[PDB]
């Protein structure tokens, strides 16, 4: 494992981790996706030519910051389109290892062991459909990336808030890691009134 | 001052009471530490962070951003068309 | 056991209680700083404002300016909703029978 | 000059809250400028609402606050200003109130010039009015709510209910002067949001 | 509240745990100190006192010895108080 | 079976003969002042000296009363140099009294014969110490000390005493015996020979 | 709502405190024992020994007492012979 | 500045005066046999008895040597009844040695007057303690016991001794002083008064 390889596996992950959730919750009509084989289970990806264009930047950029190890998190926020209030929040605490730059030694962990972990993480992601409340209102989503404060803000990008959910429940699921990056999830959802 | 501490027995009672008070103050502080602890970590998971350490970035142009624009527009188009159609109908007395 | 040994014991006890009190204080000193360096990283937090639910509860009038205003807003949205349908129905019936 | 009684302190502090809250509502544009009228209080010109509905609500809250002040059970008064649509907290004025529960076990009034208390209150109200020089224009339709922190062992009056703290995020803070009647001490501060 | 106090209780319980654990370790070490040291058969005056008869074979024997010493003393004086004068 | 009162009597009796044996064997009184008696399956020596008999009887009777009351912790025979007061030998009998026996409703199960067999072994060990204990080389006397619970009322002719410890000593530990109500341990501390 | 996952804790917390309390009083008793014995001169015979000078004021004074008593026995035995030999 | 060798001389000197004052104040020897001298800002009495002077110097001199080597752990002044050998009082001084002081690259920072003031307090506390101690009503002598590391080679004119415990004692922890290299704590155990 290298510092660039990890920066590819994890960056690639979110691409599938995001697509799936968008379907899991129904941010976009199922009739707008297209199943494709990956990892060890069948995943669903988008087919919209704008949604794909957006996710490309966020993941391409996420990847780039994965190499500099300046990335701390990635959050998928789901909010009411009219009101603007958040109802569901997905956070992935990204943990990097800056020493990976100072190696000489490709790291011992096998890529199969890594892929098996990644498979599990996705498992919960979809295994969390009969827990996670249903969105009885028109919602959208945004991608929030927590970074170091001295990091240079790329073109077309800008700082934002945490997009809190006022009264919510944080429910941890599982996680995984390569050698240089340890990603751990959980999903927070608005508390039923 | 302390030379007057020839009153060992009376002094011990005072030191005793001081021990008790210092014990109370200690426990109250320990729990306050808990509250601070619980709150801090129970919020860090909800998305909280350190301004001096963490910064939140995103795409100025994004799904939510766009969806917010074609809500705005629609309610503008709708308002307009009602006026437009209204006009046409008014034309024809 | 004697009245004499009592005086000696008192001197001894006071010295011991003095060492205890001094230990407890240097201990309160430690707690107080960590409590501060704790409430400190808390001031650096995005979210602000903390409360102890141990001795403090938060009250308000259930009927208040914000609650009344959020209501009216839904109420206004509902009227707007009911109007859109009314117009839609007039149109889809306007057109079904040639009025248009 | 006749000292400060417990009931007297509660009357003075309550009044400070009535006028301070009015000034905040007027200055932050929570209600239309024309719905306030000018009056003289503490030697200053202050704006107070003429809106019948607002008046009823403030009075209800102020009256209850005066009760809890007498009982020394109130710990804070917070003025929450939020985006009516998204519910986001945009501004939050927090007033820490320290009641001396011993002022009831007092034989005679406490010793503090009536003039000294008034000069202190005037100094805080003066600071509240001066915030117009740095607080941001609110660019969305907002409303406000008055939260009152109290002691846990307190019978919650009808018409009242428990609620969240409505904390603010990504805010800026400014602490104003405090004032005290030796019986009730009042700290004042404003947390607000600066346009990035 | 429930979830709040729950967070504080799991912290309070966890702290008491480390203490209980540390105390047992201390208690054990003190025990290893008491058993390892030289002073083993100590006297506890809060639970024990030692009694005897005020008049006993030893007090009687000591008194007899003093009286015999005196008697022998006086006799020695008498004898030399007779030899001197025969001159 | 044995009762609290029976146990106290059995133990007091052991002390009466044991103390006589120690006094004879250690030459604390001339041998011609003792006579032989058949006791404990053996032939034991007991004094004929009036003053000693009265003193021993006073101590043994009081011991018996304290044994019944379960407040005695030890009986110590202190042998000392008359002139200097130096302790030269010290027989220590640790005594454990079962305070619950006061609340017994039925005599305990241990037979009096098994108890007497244990006592005979101890008495025989006491007499066996004559082959090695050193001859006392100065005139000595003895005193009997009784360690008791702290709250015992001190009878008229009794008073508090120091423990009369011995220094530069060697010890011989003997077997214990028990009635199940009173357990008695025995040992003697004596001066290391010189030379 | 989980106001019970906090009720079980109010029980587990009182447990440790009740235990910690006993562990503390126990520790106290042990320390008091160790401290009194320390004040009495206790030590660990494997890491410490006690030395003194063979001839010291106490052994000297004791020796003189022994010589005073042997001198006393001596005079008595001698005087004894004289009186006997002299008729 | 305080050096290892200087700490040793200070401590040794303290013991010479401390021992002398205990002897005078407990009446071990006649007031008339001591002489007044000033030290540590106190008027102190020291023996004029030539034999005692010789014995004390022998011990203090050996103690200085062991203090320098950091192999001494206690000095105990044992007071006993000369006739009977009974131990009546034990004045104990624990000694804590900083074994790393041997590798110092410079004297330690502590004023000579600061140490003399701490010493003054140790000695006056002893004086203030005597007032409450049981009177010695018999003729006594004393011996100096030194606790050391078990592996210490024993000098000519020295031998192992037992600890001379007083188990039937009352005890009082008194004052301490430190030179930053040697710390001395004082305490006293004495026979529990009888009757």
DSSP secondary structure, D61-93, as one string? HHHHHHHHHHTT-EEEEEEEEEETTT--EEEEE
HEC assignment per residue over chain A = CCHHHHHHHHHHHHHHHHHHHHHHHCCCCHHHEEEEEECCEEEEEECCCCHHHHHHHHHHHHHHHHHCCCEEEEEEEEEECCCCCEEEEEEEEEEECHHHHHCCCCCCCCHHHHHHHHHHHHHHHHHCCCCCCCCCCCEEEEEEEEEECCCCCCCCEEECCCCCCCCEEEEEEEEEECCCEEEEEEEEEECCC
Of the CA atoms within 13 Å of residue H161, those in its CB half-sphere come to 23
Task: Single out the residue of F123, F144, F169 nearest to residue F55, CA to CA.
Answer: F144
Q: Which chains touch E (3 or more CB pairs under 8 A)?
A: B, C, F, G, H
Residues of chain E in contact with residue B35, where contact means CB-CB under 8 angstroms, are 8
- Structural domain total, chain C: 1
E55: helix, strand or coil? coil
- Distance, in Å, from the CA atom of H77 to the CA atom of H192, rounded to the nearest integer, reads 18
Residue A159 to residue D85, Cβ atoms within 8 A: no
SS3 assignment, position F142? strand
Nearest CB partner across the interface for F86, out of H84, H168, H195: H84
Number of domains in chain F: 1
Interface of A with B in 43-72 (CB under 8 A): 51, 54, 57-58, 72
Cα–Cα distance measured from residue H54 to residue H58, given in angstroms and rounded to the nearest whole number: 6
Residues within 8 A of A (CB atoms), C 8-47 only? 46-47
Kindly report the CATH number assigned to the domain that includes residue A99: 3.30.900.10
Interface of H with G in 80-139 (CB under 8 A): 80, 82-83, 85, 90, 92
Residue in A58, A81, A144 closest to B56 by CB: A144
Q: Are strands D160-162 and F34-39 parallel, antiparallel or unpaired?
A: unpaired
Tokens of G56: 């010291």
The nearest alpha carbon in chain F to E43 belongs to F163
Partners of G49 on chain H (C-beta within 8 Å) are: 147-150, 152, 160
Q: Which chains touch D (3 or more CB pairs under 8 A)?
A: A, C
Among the partner-chain residues D83, D164, D196, the one whose CB lies closest to the CB of A167 is D164
Do A187 and A171 form a contact (C-beta atoms < 8 A)?
yes
The closest of A166, A165, A167, A171 to A185, measured between CA atoms, is A171
- F88, HSE (Cβ side, Cα atoms, 13 Å): 23
Range(s) of the domain holding residue G35 = 1-87
Residue H176, judged by CB atoms within 10 A of its CB (0-12, 13-18, 19+), counts as: middle
Residues of B with CB under 8 A from a CB of C: 5, 8-9, 11-12, 15-16, 18-19, 22-23, 25-26, 29-33, 35-37, 39-40, 43, 46-54, 78, 82
Q: In this structure, what DSSP letter does residue F110 have?
A: -
Residue range(s) defining the domain that contains residue D39: 1-196
Nearest to C31 among B15, B29, B48 (CB): B29
What is the rounded (10 degree) CA torsion for F63, F69, F71, F74? 30
If DSSP codes are grouped into helix, strand and coil, which group holds residue H187?
A: strand
User: Residues of D with CB below 8 A from A164's CB?
Assistant: 169
**Which of chain C's residues have a Cβ under 8 Å away from the Cβ of A161?**
46
Burial A134-165 (b: 16+ CB within 10 A, else e): ebeeebbbbbbbbbeeeeeeeeebeebbbbbb
Per the DSSP assignment, residues forming a β-bridge with A92 are A74, A185
CB contact under 8 A, B30 and E15: yes
Please list every residue in chain C whose beta carbon sits closer than 8 Å to the beta carbon of residue B35. 50, 52, 54
> Which residue among E1, E5, E45 sits closest to C1, beta carbon to beta carbon?
E45
Residues linked to residue F149 through DSSP beta bridges, in sequence order: E48
CB within 8 Å: D154 and C57: yes
Resolution in A: 2.0
Query: Which residues of chain H does E43 touch, with a Cβ-Cβ cutoff of 8 Å?
Result: 167-169, 192
Give first-to-last CA distance, chain E, whole Å.
Answer: 116
Residues of B whose CB is below 8 A from A143: 58-59, 62
Q: What is the CATH number of the domain that holds B89?
A: 6.10.250.90
Dihedral angle at the C-alpha atoms of F61, F62, F64, F69, nearest 10 degrees?
Answer: 150
- Residue H170 touches chain C, beta carbons under 8 Å: yes
What contacts F32, CB < 8 A, 6 or more positions away? none
* Spatial CA neighbour of A7 closest among A71, A90, A87, A93: A71
Of H164, H168, H195, the CB nearest to F163: H168
Chains in touch with A (3+ beta-carbon pairs under 8 Å) read B, C, D
Give the integer Cα–Cα distance in Å for A56 and A74. 14
B70 to chain A, any CB pair closer than 8 A? The answer is no
Residues of D in contact with A85 (CB under 8 A): 86-87
Q: Which residues of H136-149 are buried (b: 16+ CB within 10 A; e: fewer)?
A: beeebbbbbbbbbe
Q: Does E2 touch chain H (CB under 8 A)?
A: no
Residue G48 sits at the chain H interface (C-beta within 8 Å): yes
CB-CB under 8 Å, E24 with G27: no
- Quick one: A21 exposed, middle or buried, by C-beta within 10 A (0-12, 13-18, 19+)? buried
Number of CB pairs < 8 Å for C and E? 4
Size of interface C-D (CB pairs under 8 A): 91
β-bridge pairing F87-97 and F158-160: unpaired
Q: How far is the alpha carbon of E33 from chain H, nearest alpha carbon, in Å?
A: 17
């Amino acid at each position: 494992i290298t510092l660039r390889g990890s920066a590819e596996i994890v960056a690639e992950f979110f691409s599938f981790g995001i697509n799936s959730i968008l379907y899991q919750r129904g941010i976009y009509p199922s009739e707008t996706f297209t199943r494709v084989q990956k990892y060890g289970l069948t995943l669903l990806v988008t087919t919209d030519l704008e949604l794909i264009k957006y996710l490309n930047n966020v993941v391409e950029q996420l990847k780039d910051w994965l190499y500099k190890c300046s990335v701390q998190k990635l959050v998928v926020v789901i909010s009411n389109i009219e009101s603007g209030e958040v109802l569901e929040r997905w956070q992935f605490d990204i943990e990097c290892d800056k020493t990976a730059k100072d190696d000489s030694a490709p790291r011992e962990k096998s890529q199969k062991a890594i892929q098996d972990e990644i498979r599990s993480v996705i498992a919960q992601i979809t295994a969390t459909v009969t827990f996670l409340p249903l969105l009885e209102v028109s919602c959208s989503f945004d991608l929030l990336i927590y970074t170091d404060k001295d990091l240079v803000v790329p073109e077309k990008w800008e700082e934002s808030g945490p997009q809190f959910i006022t009264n919510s429940e944080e429910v941890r699921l599982r996680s995984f890691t390569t050698t240089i990056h340890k990603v751990n999830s959980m999903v927070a959802y608005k508390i039923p009134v | 001052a302390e030379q007057s501490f020839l009153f060992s027995r009376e002094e011990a009672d005072t030191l005793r009471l001081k021990v008790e008070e210092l014990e109370g103050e200690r426990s109250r502080l320990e729990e306050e530490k808990r509250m601070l602890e619980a709150q801090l970590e129970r919020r860090a998971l909800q998305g909280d962070y350190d301004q001096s350490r963490t910064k939140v970035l995103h795409m100025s142009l994004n799904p939510t951003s766009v969806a917010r624009q074609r809500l705005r527009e629609d309610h503008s188009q709708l308002q307009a068309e009602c006026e437009r159609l209204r006009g046409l109908l008014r034309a024809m007395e």
